[PDB]
Write an enzyme that holds these catalytic residues in place. Structure first.
Site, PDB file in Angstrom:
ATOM      1  N   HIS A  35      14.139 -17.162 -16.391  1.00 55.81           N
ATOM      2  CA  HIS A  35      12.914 -17.048 -15.634  1.00 55.81           C
ATOM      3  C   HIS A  35      12.422 -15.608 -15.625  1.00 55.81           C
ATOM      4  CE1 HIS A  35      10.011 -17.531 -12.373  1.00 55.81           C
ATOM      5  NE2 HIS A  35      10.562 -16.434 -11.829  1.00 55.81           N
ATOM      6  N   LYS A  91      12.428 -13.386  -6.889  1.00 58.25           N
ATOM      7  CA  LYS A  91      12.250 -12.217  -6.071  1.00 58.25           C
ATOM      8  C   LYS A  91      10.751 -12.067  -5.996  1.00 58.25           C
ATOM      9  CE  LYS A  91      13.206  -8.739  -9.281  1.00 58.25           C
ATOM     10  NZ  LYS A  91      13.765  -7.402  -9.589  1.00 58.25           N
ATOM     11  N   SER A 131      19.513  -9.078   1.049  1.00 52.33           N
ATOM     12  CA  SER A 131      18.642  -7.923   0.954  1.00 52.33           C
ATOM     13  C   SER A 131      18.356  -7.298   2.295  1.00 52.33           C
ATOM     14  CB  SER A 131      17.314  -8.427   0.364  1.00 52.33           C
ATOM     15  OG  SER A 131      16.227  -7.541   0.590  1.00 52.33           O
ATOM     16  N   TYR A 156      10.007 -14.754   0.766  1.00 54.67           N
ATOM     17  CA  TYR A 156      11.171 -14.312   0.029  1.00 54.67           C
ATOM     18  C   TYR A 156      12.261 -13.847   1.013  1.00 54.67           C
ATOM     19  CZ  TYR A 156      14.244 -10.964  -2.269  1.00 54.67           C
ATOM     20  OH  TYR A 156      15.352 -10.289  -2.704  1.00 54.67           O
ATOM     21  N   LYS A 160      16.058 -15.472   2.148  1.00 51.84           N
ATOM     22  CA  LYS A 160      17.329 -14.762   2.160  1.00 51.84           C
ATOM     23  C   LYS A 160      18.041 -14.937   3.512  1.00 51.84           C
ATOM     24  CE  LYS A 160      17.754 -12.945  -2.101  1.00 51.84           C
ATOM     25  NZ  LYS A 160      18.615 -13.651  -3.064  1.00 51.84           N
ATOM     26  N   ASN A 186      17.487  -0.507  -2.209  1.00 51.15           N
ATOM     27  CA  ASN A 186      16.578  -0.487  -3.384  1.00 51.15           C
ATOM     28  C   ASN A 186      17.306  -0.063  -4.657  1.00 51.15           C
ATOM     29  OD1 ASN A 186      14.939  -0.462  -0.927  1.00 51.15           O
ATOM     30  ND2 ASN A 186      13.225  -0.412  -2.357  1.00 51.15           N
ATOM     31  N   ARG A 238      12.623   4.945   1.293  1.00 46.72           N
ATOM     32  CA  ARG A 238      13.607   3.912   0.983  1.00 46.72           C
ATOM     33  C   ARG A 238      14.937   4.469   0.565  1.00 46.72           C
ATOM     34  NH1 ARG A 238       9.778   1.726   2.992  1.00 46.72           N
ATOM     35  NH2 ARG A 238       8.518   0.083   2.052  1.00 46.72           N
ATOM     36  N   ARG A 299       0.033  -1.384   0.833  1.00 40.36           N
ATOM     37  CA  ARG A 299       0.368  -2.675   0.255  1.00 40.36           C
ATOM     38  C   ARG A 299       0.772  -3.551   1.397  1.00 40.36           C
ATOM     39  NH1 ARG A 299       5.152  -3.046  -4.160  1.00 40.36           N
ATOM     40  NH2 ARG A 299       6.331  -2.348  -2.356  1.00 40.36           N
ATOM     41  N   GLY A 301       2.297  -5.736   4.113  1.00 39.87           N
ATOM     42  CA  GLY A 301       3.676  -5.953   4.522  1.00 39.87           C
ATOM     43  C   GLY A 301       4.684  -4.839   4.277  1.00 39.87           C
TER      44      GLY A 301
HETATM   45  N1  LIG Z   1      16.143  -5.690  -7.321  1.00 36.70           N
HETATM   46  C1  LIG Z   1      16.143  -5.482  -5.990  1.00 36.70           C
HETATM   47  O1  LIG Z   1      15.650  -4.460  -5.505  1.00 36.70           O
HETATM   48  C2  LIG Z   1      16.786  -6.507  -5.067  1.00 36.70           C
HETATM   49  C3  LIG Z   1      16.855  -6.143  -3.688  1.00 36.70           C
HETATM   50  C4  LIG Z   1      17.236  -7.216  -2.881  1.00 36.70           C
HETATM   51  C5  LIG Z   1      18.020  -8.266  -3.254  1.00 36.70           C
HETATM   52  N2  LIG Z   1      17.905  -8.562  -4.615  1.00 36.70           N
HETATM   53  C6  LIG Z   1      18.417  -9.885  -5.104  1.00 36.70           C
HETATM   54  O2  LIG Z   1      19.451  -9.720  -6.035  1.00 36.70           O
HETATM   55  C7  LIG Z   1      19.328 -10.743  -7.070  1.00 36.70           C
HETATM   56  C8  LIG Z   1      19.193 -10.053  -8.417  1.00 36.70           C
HETATM   57  O3  LIG Z   1      17.978  -9.302  -8.392  1.00 36.70           O
HETATM   58  P1  LIG Z   1      17.523  -8.598  -9.764  1.00 36.70           P
HETATM   59  O4  LIG Z   1      16.791  -7.351  -9.476  1.00 36.70           O
HETATM   60  O5  LIG Z   1      18.610  -8.480 -10.728  1.00 36.70           O
HETATM   61  O6  LIG Z   1      16.485  -9.736 -10.270  1.00 36.70           O
HETATM   62  P2  LIG Z   1      16.321 -10.405 -11.676  1.00 36.70           P
HETATM   63  O7  LIG Z   1      15.086 -11.173 -11.623  1.00 36.70           O
HETATM   64  O8  LIG Z   1      16.444  -9.438 -12.820  1.00 36.70           O
HETATM   65  O9  LIG Z   1      17.628 -11.286 -11.709  1.00 36.70           O
HETATM   66  C9  LIG Z   1      17.619 -12.659 -11.285  1.00 36.70           C
HETATM   67  C10 LIG Z   1      18.019 -13.516 -12.470  1.00 36.70           C
HETATM   68  O10 LIG Z   1      17.978 -14.900 -12.013  1.00 36.70           O
HETATM   69  C11 LIG Z   1      17.463 -15.707 -13.029  1.00 36.70           C
HETATM   70  N3  LIG Z   1      16.981 -16.919 -12.387  1.00 36.70           N
HETATM   71  C12 LIG Z   1      15.894 -17.080 -11.603  1.00 36.70           C
HETATM   72  N4  LIG Z   1      15.723 -18.350 -11.200  1.00 36.70           N
HETATM   73  C13 LIG Z   1      16.804 -19.014 -11.730  1.00 36.70           C
HETATM   74  C14 LIG Z   1      17.182 -20.384 -11.686  1.00 36.70           C
HETATM   75  N5  LIG Z   1      16.496 -21.303 -11.035  1.00 36.70           N
HETATM   76  N6  LIG Z   1      18.330 -20.715 -12.354  1.00 36.70           N
HETATM   77  C15 LIG Z   1      19.027 -19.750 -13.043  1.00 36.70           C
HETATM   78  N7  LIG Z   1      18.729 -18.466 -13.146  1.00 36.70           N
HETATM   79  C16 LIG Z   1      17.594 -18.157 -12.474  1.00 36.70           C
HETATM   80  C17 LIG Z   1      16.373 -14.854 -13.637  1.00 36.70           C
HETATM   81  O11 LIG Z   1      16.064 -15.313 -14.960  1.00 36.70           O
HETATM   82  C18 LIG Z   1      17.030 -13.452 -13.655  1.00 36.70           C
HETATM   83  O12 LIG Z   1      17.731 -13.106 -14.855  1.00 36.70           O
HETATM   84  C19 LIG Z   1      18.205 -11.660  -6.665  1.00 36.70           C
HETATM   85  O13 LIG Z   1      18.661 -12.794  -5.896  1.00 36.70           O
HETATM   86  C20 LIG Z   1      17.358 -10.738  -5.791  1.00 36.70           C
HETATM   87  O14 LIG Z   1      16.599 -11.550  -4.853  1.00 36.70           O
HETATM   88  C21 LIG Z   1      17.343  -7.700  -5.540  1.00 36.70           C
HETATM   89  O1  LIG Z   2       3.511   0.983  -7.558  1.00 40.37           O
HETATM   90  C1  LIG Z   2       4.104   1.215  -6.524  1.00 40.37           C
HETATM   91  C2  LIG Z   2       5.289   0.590  -6.057  1.00 40.37           C
HETATM   92  C3  LIG Z   2       5.838   0.943  -4.918  1.00 40.37           C
HETATM   93  N1  LIG Z   2       5.290   1.922  -4.124  1.00 40.37           N
HETATM   94  C4  LIG Z   2       5.969   2.272  -2.886  1.00 40.37           C
HETATM   95  O2  LIG Z   2       7.263   2.599  -3.221  1.00 40.37           O
HETATM   96  C5  LIG Z   2       8.174   2.136  -2.183  1.00 40.37           C
HETATM   97  C6  LIG Z   2       9.177   1.175  -2.768  1.00 40.37           C
HETATM   98  O3  LIG Z   2       8.458  -0.023  -3.106  1.00 40.37           O
HETATM   99  P1  LIG Z   2       9.181  -1.108  -4.027  1.00 40.37           P
HETATM  100  O4  LIG Z   2       9.884  -0.550  -5.192  1.00 40.37           O
HETATM  101  O5  LIG Z   2       8.235  -2.215  -4.282  1.00 40.37           O
HETATM  102  O6  LIG Z   2      10.315  -1.476  -2.967  1.00 40.37           O
HETATM  103  P2  LIG Z   2      10.375  -2.290  -1.681  1.00 40.37           P
HETATM  104  O7  LIG Z   2       9.143  -3.004  -1.315  1.00 40.37           O
HETATM  105  O8  LIG Z   2      10.965  -1.438  -0.621  1.00 40.37           O
HETATM  106  O9  LIG Z   2      11.486  -3.608  -2.156  1.00 40.37           O
HETATM  107  C7  LIG Z   2      12.655  -3.352  -3.119  1.00 40.37           C
HETATM  108  O10 LIG Z   2      13.808  -3.248  -2.266  1.00 40.37           O
HETATM  109  C8  LIG Z   2      13.919  -4.267  -1.248  1.00 40.37           C
HETATM  110  C9  LIG Z   2      15.147  -3.881  -0.406  1.00 40.37           C
HETATM  111  O11 LIG Z   2      14.858  -2.802   0.491  1.00 40.37           O
HETATM  112  C10 LIG Z   2      14.071  -5.656  -1.852  1.00 40.37           C
HETATM  113  O12 LIG Z   2      14.176  -6.666  -0.837  1.00 40.37           O
HETATM  114  C11 LIG Z   2      12.925  -5.904  -2.819  1.00 40.37           C
HETATM  115  O13 LIG Z   2      13.234  -7.118  -3.520  1.00 40.37           O
HETATM  116  C12 LIG Z   2      12.804  -4.710  -3.784  1.00 40.37           C
HETATM  117  O14 LIG Z   2      11.859  -4.971  -4.837  1.00 40.37           O
HETATM  118  C13 LIG Z   2       7.306   1.556  -1.091  1.00 40.37           C
HETATM  119  O15 LIG Z   2       7.035   2.558  -0.101  1.00 40.37           O
HETATM  120  C14 LIG Z   2       6.042   1.150  -1.883  1.00 40.37           C
HETATM  121  O16 LIG Z   2       4.881   1.199  -1.034  1.00 40.37           O
HETATM  122  C15 LIG Z   2       4.135   2.593  -4.481  1.00 40.37           C
HETATM  123  O17 LIG Z   2       3.613   3.486  -3.835  1.00 40.37           O
HETATM  124  N2  LIG Z   2       3.595   2.197  -5.669  1.00 40.37           N
END
Ligand SMILES: NC(=O)c1ccc[n+]([C@@H]2O[C@H](COP(=O)([O-])OP(=O)(O)OC[C@H]3O[C@@H](n4cnc5c(N)ncnc54)[C@H](O)[C@@H]3O)[C@@H](O)[C@H]2O)c1
Ligand SMILES: O=c1ccn([C@@H]2O[C@H](COP(=O)(O)OP(=O)(O)O[C@H]3O[C@H](CO)[C@@H](O)[C@H](O)[C@H]3O)[C@@H](O)[C@H]2O)c(=O)[nH]1
Ligand SMILES: NC(=O)c1ccc[n+]([C@@H]2O[C@H](COP(=O)([O-])OP(=O)(O)OC[C@H]3O[C@@H](n4cnc5c(N)ncnc54)[C@H](O)[C@@H]3O)[C@@H](O)[C@H]2O)c1
Ligand SMILES: O=c1ccn([C@@H]2O[C@H](COP(=O)(O)OP(=O)(O)O[C@H]3O[C@H](CO)[C@@H](O)[C@H](O)[C@H]3O)[C@@H](O)[C@H]2O)c(=O)[nH]1
Ligand SMILES: [Cl-]
Ligand SMILES: [Cl-]
Ligand SMILES: [Cl-]
Ligand SMILES: [Cl-]
Ligand SMILES: [Mg+2]
Lengths: 347, 345
Positions: A35, A91, A131, A156, A160, A186, A238, A299, A301
């Site tokens: 995905h 996500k 998260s 989202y 969680k 983050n 962050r 942005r 939220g």
């Molecule tokens: N990246 C962040 O900042 C962040 C912060 C908070 C929590 N998380 C959580 O950690 C996890 C990993 O995040 P990430 O950044 O690696 O995201 P990501 O999108 O790279 O990884 C998620 C993976 O899940 C797969 N996937 C999605 N739907 C699926 C389904 N129905 N069946 C099987 N596979 C499926 C996607 O193809 C992808 O490779 C997620 O659950 C996300 O919500 C991420």
């Molecule tokens: O183009 C951009 C993107 C982000 N931001 C700012 O940069 C910061 C970080 O934003 P972003 O990278 O989107 O992070 P968050 O919204 O804090 O969320 C990240 O981290 C969270 C955990 O704190 C997770 O739940 C989310 O999935 C993940 O994407 C924030 O102040 C945003 O307003 C900008 O100014 N410009």
């Protein structure tokens, strides 16, 4: 030996974790539906094909959706898993608010199904990707595990939260379950090789990839979402944590399960917050390039500031985020520079 | 478009609502998997077979599970629904705490599957069976819709709150949806005919059926779960509401959906609370039998008192409960006395 199932293993955090697992002596079995992961020239996702090269260890993979009951059941029947690390899910590309049912189906029903399949196959050890969003708008800082959860802004985050709640009840009802809920902050950066990293599709919704894209010359300027927040420089703050450290925290989580720990919840962050401008500056330093930006509207939220209280994890998990800001930026830069357009199939 | 889908329509509240729908001129289509309903001699669940006889109107029924996507798809293709009243789910037989997954699967996954099919088919009008349990331990009484919700004690109650939250999100995301969330208080009583009523299997978990079973002689005595609460008599206080009024509230909810109301939430209670002992006494009066009781320890997670603030429902839904205590007890007794073994054996 028994395996470790890694759902969503081809993604950002998942691929880095598969790498850590392989290096630590574990035997993962990875599933993903592509995905949000790039298909490689062969059967393996490109990210994992590279992890295989990097580690010199084979990656067992099956393309599969966690929503596919029959496939998941067959998988649990075929292997003897000792634990499951659940990264699979949606996500948000800031999409959640508009497509609630997709989040509820993929995240919520997908996880319920996984838990049911797990139980039926006698696998009661889980590591769940949670998260900092579950805390909602911070009522205080830093955010410790005791901070109220729930009251999240979007589907989202609620997804969680509902999952955490479900797992907590499950553990409450059956003392034989062990579950580690990891609230990530983050994640940023990339494996030090520069071979794998965050591979966003289209216009990045998150900060870092956007910044790196500007630095590499793909984008002209960073759009800063508001500069009137109640923070030192007015920009969002962050707790950025190196994906490698985050990945390693998963290994710590597996060790914790082995202690028959029951339900445990830990923040995975550095305890240090950085503003948008500070990240831009760090990226200029890492990349050796000026990174322009323009301030635009807030942005929807977005919170002013969020950062963790990482003591519980240091204490109970025996884990700490060892990599600093410069390391994060340098690693992200290496990945970006070496792979100007993210992953691609082999030439 | 035309019909009203009633999930879990063979159950206690559902069967009564099916009856009300039929008498009001609606055309219901009912689905149920018999998880907690008794099968009659024919196709229909006994409760519905009786509703059919009582109303002299036919009941359109399909045996199926909300968790079956294939069956849902076929159902929605077969009929043109204008709205769905969703009663199907697992309730607690004090079970929830011990079997979380069953609750989450049936209540959460089942509701999400339903919502998805509704969306797919453009049937964006729902009436949902919620509960006063979503308010958690009362912070103040009576409970109005503005009282805090969430932070529920059990998997069952949590499930209800999570569903409300999902529905709210859906309505936010798509302004075309209309949803009425009904927070029932403590349903009791039975249709005046005495032909249908609550049909628990085994030892009842809820007060009223236990009370009626002691009166009819099926149980020796009622166990009163504590007499040391901060209530006028020390026993738990609840807002008992007649199932007939509750069923009628669903019709008022249907009319509300027609206003294109978006997401609305209403308590369905009388506003009057009664203690365990008051209920026992009223049942003695109604049945002409003695109902011995023994005071035991408080029950895990019980609240001292819970009752509704019925103002909003009266004002917005245009509905109020009309039947009082004596009527509830008279009706409950009639059902129990006339059907000593419930719908069947
Ligand atoms: N990246 C962040 O900042 C962040 C912060 C908070 C929590 N998380 C959580 O950690 C996890 C990993 O995040 P990430 O950044 O690696 O995201 P990501 O999108 O790279 O990884 C998620 C993976 O899940 C797969 N996937 C999605 N739907 C699926 C389904 N129905 N069946 C099987 N596979 C499926 C996607 O193809 C992808 O490779 C997620 O659950 C996300 O919500 C991420
Ligand atoms: O183009 C951009 C993107 C982000 N931001 C700012 O940069 C910061 C970080 O934003 P972003 O990278 O989107 O992070 P968050 O919204 O804090 O969320 C990240 O981290 C969270 C955990 O704190 C997770 O739940 C989310 O999935 C993940 O994407 C924030 O102040 C945003 O307003 C900008 O100014 N410009
Ligand atoms: N009775 C109460 O005190 C109470 C309190 C508040 C809210 N509620 C809720 O109101 C609704 C109706 O309660 P009730 O007292 O009539 O209970 P009930 O058990 O008599 O009715 C529920 C019906 O749903 C059916 N069902 C269960 N799982 C199903 C599935 N997977 N697919 C299809 N049908 C399924 C059952 O067979 C049953 O006939 C439920 O959602 C309940 O949680 C009831
Ligand atoms: O054998 C029994 C059963 C009940 N009680 C007491 O009677 C009262 C009512 O108990 P019960 O019928 O089990 O209802 P509740 O504990 O209030 O829970 C109900 O009320 C909620 C709304 O208030 C609904 O959402 C729930 O689904 C419904 O089961 C309480 O004070 C109980 O402690 C006894 O003393 N002995
Ligand atoms: Cl390959
Ligand atoms: Cl019949
Ligand atoms: Cl039709
Ligand atoms: Cl369970
Ligand atoms: Mg500490």
């Amino acid at each position: 030996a028994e395996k470790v199932l890694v759902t969503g293993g081809a993604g950002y955090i998942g691929s880095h974790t598969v790498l850590e697992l392989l290096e630590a002596g574990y035997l993962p079995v990875v599933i993903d539906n592509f995905h949000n992961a790039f298909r490689g020239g062969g059967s393996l996702p490109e990210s994992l094909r590279r992890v295989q090269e990097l580690t010199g260890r084979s990656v067992e993979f099956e393309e599969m959706d966690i929503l596919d009951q029959g496939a998941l059941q067959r998988l649990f029947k075929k292997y003897s898993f000792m634990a499951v690390i659940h990264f699979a899910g949606l996500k948000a590309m800031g999409e959640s608010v508009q497509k609630p049912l997709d989040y509820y189906r993929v995240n919520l029903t997908g996880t319920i199904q996984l838990l049911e399949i797990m139980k039926a196959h006698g696998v009661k050890n889980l590591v769940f990707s949670s998260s900092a969003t579950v805390y909602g708008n911070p009522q205080y800082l830093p955010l410790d595990e005791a901070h109220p959860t729930g009251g999240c802004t979007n589907p989202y985050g609620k997804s969680k939260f509902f999952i955490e709640e479900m797992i907590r009840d499950l553990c409450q009802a059956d003392k034989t379950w062990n579950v580690v809920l990891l609230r990530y902050f983050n994640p940023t950066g990339a494996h030090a090789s520069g071979c794998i990293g965050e591979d966003p599709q289209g216009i990045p919704n998150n900060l870092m990839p956007y910044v790196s894209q500007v630095a590499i010359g793909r984008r002209e300027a960073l759009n800063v979402f508001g500069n009137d927040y109640d923070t030192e420089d007015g920009t969002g703050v962050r707790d950025y944590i190196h994906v490698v450290d985050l990945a390693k925290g998963h290994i710590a989580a597996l060790r914790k399960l082995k202690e028959q720990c029951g339900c445990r919840i830990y923040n995975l962050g550095t305890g240090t917050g950085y503003s948008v401008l500070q990240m831009v500056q760090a990226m200029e330093k890492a990349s050796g390039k000026k990174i322009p930006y323009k301030v635009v509207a807030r942005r929807e939220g977005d919170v002013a500031a969020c950062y963790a209280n990482p003591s519980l994890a240091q204490e109970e998990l025996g884990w700490t985020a060892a990599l600093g800001l410069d390391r994060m930026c340098e690693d992200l830069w290496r990945w970006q520079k070496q792979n100007p357009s993210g992953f691609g199939t082999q030439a």
